[PDB]
From a paper:
To better illustrate whether DM strategy alters the substrate-binding mode, we solved crystal structures of an inactive WT TfCut variant (S170A) and its complex with the PBAT analog. The WT TfCut contains the combination of His/Phe in positions of 224 and 228 below W195 and this pair fixes the W195-bareing loop and its indole ring in the C-type conformation. This leads to a narrower substrate entering portal (circled in Fig. 4a). The same structural feature should be shared by canonical cutinases as revealed in the LCC-ICCG complex because the His/Phe duo is strictly conserved in similar enzymes.
In addition, the substrate-binding site is more expansive in cutinases compared to esterases, benefiting the binding of bulkier macromolecules.
Author numbering: 41 to 301
Amino acid sequence: MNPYERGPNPTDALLEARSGPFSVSEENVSRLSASGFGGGTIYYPRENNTYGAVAISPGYTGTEASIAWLGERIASHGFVVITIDTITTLDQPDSRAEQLNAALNHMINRASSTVRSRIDSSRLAVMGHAMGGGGSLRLASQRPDLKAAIPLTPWHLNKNWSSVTVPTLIIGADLDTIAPVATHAKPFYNSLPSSISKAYLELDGATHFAPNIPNKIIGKYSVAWLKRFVDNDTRYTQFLCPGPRDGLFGEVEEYRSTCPF
């Protein structure tokens, strides 16, 4: 009925697993093949179909290796995902925004036919870690046609994101000393309009480095957000609404959403 649906009916166990049901192959994007970003890796499902497409940016001083596990894991649930390097490791968030955009266009227009034929260019998403998450917010702001945005422990000097109407899941970490949730992630979530689809999930016992370490919470709710908004897959509403519990015996420090979507 929903022809964007891919994979079997979900459970906590399948969403928390290290790998989804799709086997994954990779396309290397060399620095000189890439226009407007530093190259990276495209993870894509071997099974021929069309899928939504995600661009992910690392943070200050980092490269694609620090978010590789995430590109693999998300692709293994039926998405085409690029993990980018930036032009320099020191690029600022609003520069990372522009480079994420360039990576979306690379996947759609300049990659091999193998990749291009597997992308529904109308269903795109953006993610990023730390300054990359800042880049996520800016691009989401600039491209309200994107289907989802997921800033992970995001970092940005601009705290006002009321121009964002893309469905946005911000993931904060309670022990993050580099982008403390009080001065970044929460003000980001709070300034996003109350009228859009958004959610704030704060990890419990997690540093700035948590998105760089295979993490079953991040993987589960990142895929669920993408399934729900890139594929319009309502089989995944159950994980977002009411969402993870932040109370007694809960899995999360804090979860806040505009459920129902």
